Amino acid sequence: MSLSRSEEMHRLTENVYKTIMEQFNPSLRNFIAMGKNYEKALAGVTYAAKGYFDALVKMGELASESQGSKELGDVLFQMAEVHRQIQNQLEEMLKSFHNELLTQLEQKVELDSRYLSAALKKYQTEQRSKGDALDKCQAELKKLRKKSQGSKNPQKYSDKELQYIDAISNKQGELENYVSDGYKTALTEERRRFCFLVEKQCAVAKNSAAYHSKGKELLAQKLPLWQQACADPSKIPERAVQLMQQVA
């Protein structure tokens, strides 16, 4: 009963390590690879966005120097400025994505390769030698019982038999305790790794939220004004109207 249940925990414990080594960590390596690709792609946007908003600033310059669209100069400059602020918050999340998520997860899989192997082998080696010491102890008592039973004075050898019964109970206790500790440890190892992944994700999501809220905020202020500014393409500047009046 205690044996059955203990051997089951032993199986469960082994399955946990096997699952981390064979499923969790290889899938996590793929997640990391996919994340490096994502980082590469987002970083690619950085450079491209800058030549875009530089080109936009250039149109703002031309507008500044125009005969009748000078107002649209500052509008174009503020469109570029809004981006500059947004793209900066992006770069903040990109730094945290690299430094806090990717680097930390990579360091963790790297450590695990030797750690999990070693931790498993140590568990297996010790669990086995504890079982073996118990088995040997049980065989020793069984021999002693066969000897004492077929003897005129069975009482004589019983003090050693009682001592053997104690040793057996202690060893069985030690084995069961070792197995239940190993099982709690295995579960803790499994859970800490999922939790760390979720923790790292939350960290970048907090940076994404700050990035998006900044984007929303800056556009809410500026967009109605930009929409109003370009709203009348037929608008002649005062100087031009005065000039036309002079030729009249």
Contacts (CB under 8 A) with a second copy, residues 77-106: 79, 82, 86
Query: How many other C-beta atoms lie within 10 A of the C-beta of residue 65?
Result: 10
Least separation in angstroms between residue 146's CB and a second copy is: 30
The size of the interface with a second copy (CB under 8 A), counted in residues, is 98
Nearer to a second copy, 162 or 220 (CB): 220
Helix (H, G, I), strand (E, B) or coil at 97: helix
6: nearest Cα among 187, 136, 177, 188: 177
Q: Residues 85, 214: contact at Cβ < 8 Å? A: yes
Asked if 243 touches a second copy (CB under 8 A), the answer is: yes
Query: Looking at 35, 109, 161, 168, which residue binds a second copy (CB under 8 A)?
Result: 35
H or E segment at 6?
helix 2-19
Q: Residues 61, 73: contact at Cβ < 8 Å? A: yes
128: nearest Cα among 139, 136, 118, 117: 136
- Return the range that interacts with a second copy (CB under 8 A); candidates 112-120, 128-136, 158-166, 214-222: 214-222
Query: Looking at 14, 21, 42, 91, which residue binds a second copy (CB under 8 A)?
Result: 42
Query: Looking at 129, 146, 202, 238, which residue binds a second copy (CB under 8 A)?
Result: 202
Query: Looking at 122, 156, 160, 216, which residue binds a second copy (CB under 8 A)?
Result: 216
Least separation in angstroms between residue 15's CB and a second copy is: 7
Least separation in angstroms between residue 161's CB and a second copy is: 24
Nearer to a second copy, 68 or 154 (CB): 68
72: nearest Cα among 80, 83, 81, 64: 64
Length of the chain: 248
Question: Interface mask (CB under 8 A) for a second copy, residues 174-193, using x and -?
Answer: --xx-xx--xx-xxx-xxx-
d(CA 222, CA 231): 14
Q: What is the DSSP letter of 156?
A: T
Nearer to a second copy, 136 or 194 (CB): 194
Q: Which of residues 130-169 bind a second copy (CB under 8 A)?
A: none
Q: Could you tell me the two tokens for 219?
A: 């556009």
- Side chain identity at 220, as an amino acid letter? A
Query: Looking at 11, 18, 44, 170, which residue binds a second copy (CB under 8 A)?
Result: 44
Asked if 238 touches a second copy (CB under 8 A), the answer is: no
